[PDB]
């Protein structure tokens, strides 16, 4: 990741306003609605049979908060995403065998969720900064595949 100094402050300012419970449940539930094959990894969370089941699934919503909390740990360590996500890369690659393309899709959905909540504040410049961040998080999580 190479963020300008202006982009580092845009990223940190927006994140300070993020409700990780609300937006993290929203991001993970939108991944499972929009890209339904991702439900394969969460079948043990109960009913995922329809989009309405995904959107009301208490475990999917709780898990999404964990995922966004981990994204926020990335934001604190933009100079060392590989190390920050080492353990999680081992989990997703070595234990879960999630194809790393899916990490990019979840980053896509996170950017969409940020745009939905921040409106006019999520300008093209602020989006571009987040696009660099989510690309770097995806690449970092994929490191144990490399």
């Amino acid at each position: 990741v190479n963020l300008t100094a202006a982009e580092k402050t845009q990223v940190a300012n927006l994140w300070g306003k993020v409700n990780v419970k609300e937006l993290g449940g929203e991001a993970l539930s939108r991944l499972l609605v929009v890209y339904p094959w991702t439900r394969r990894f969460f079948e043990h969370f109960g009913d995922l049979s329809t989009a309405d089941a995904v959107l009301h699934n208490a475990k999917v919503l709780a898990h999404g908060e964990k995922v966004l909390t981990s994204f926020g740990e990335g934001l604190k360590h933009l100079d060392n995403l590989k190390g920050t996500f080492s353990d999680l890369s081992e989990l997703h690659c070595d234990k879960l065998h999630v194809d790393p393309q899916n990490f990019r899709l979840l980053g896509n959905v996170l950017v969409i969720v940020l745009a939905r909540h921040f409106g006019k504040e999520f300008t093209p410049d602020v989006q571009a900064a987040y696009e660099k961040v989510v690309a770097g998080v995806a690449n970092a999580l994929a490191h144990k595949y490399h």
Partner: protein
């Protein structure tokens, strides 16, 4: 062709975009050029800075084509045939770039119409933009 439920969602959403289509697509193109600078090389003949008349004009044309598509969901190949030849044969646009523009259209719609942009609307619009992109790259068969 899109399922009945997705067609309904796409036509509802497009109707709510209404006369904002040209402005929203122009913003989507700006978002693509800013976020994914690789895409700028297809437009060396444009001024790509913010407020660009060329980008605004182009947004209107792309928005018109999307409006045509929303009206022709059962015959996208014929409705978009000249554009397929333009993008795949003449311009040789890399298929990845249709994903980037589709994502920036979804970001732009989500930012402007947050209440309308539910997970089900997102899913149906993603499928619509995939189907438009598939038709525009059909020469790559």
């Amino acid at each position: 062709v899109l399922s009945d439920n997705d067609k309904t969602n796409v036509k509802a959403t497009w109707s709510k975009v209404g006369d904002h289509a040209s402005d929203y697509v122009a913003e989507a193109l700006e978002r693509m050029f800013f976020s994914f600078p690789t895409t700028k090389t297809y437009f060396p003949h444009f001024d790509l800075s913010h407020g660009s008349g060329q980008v605004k004009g182009h947004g209107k044309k792309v928005g018109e084509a999307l409006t045509q598509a929303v009206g022709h969901l059962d015959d996208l190949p014929s409705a978009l045939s000249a554009l397929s030849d333009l993008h795949a044969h003449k311009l040789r646009v890399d298929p990845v770039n249709f994903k980037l523009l589709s994502h920036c259209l979804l970001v732009t719609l989500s930012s402007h119409q947050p209440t309308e942009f539910t997970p089900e609307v997102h899913a149906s619009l993603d499928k619509f933009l995939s189907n438009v992109s598939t038709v525009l790259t059909s020469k790559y068969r």
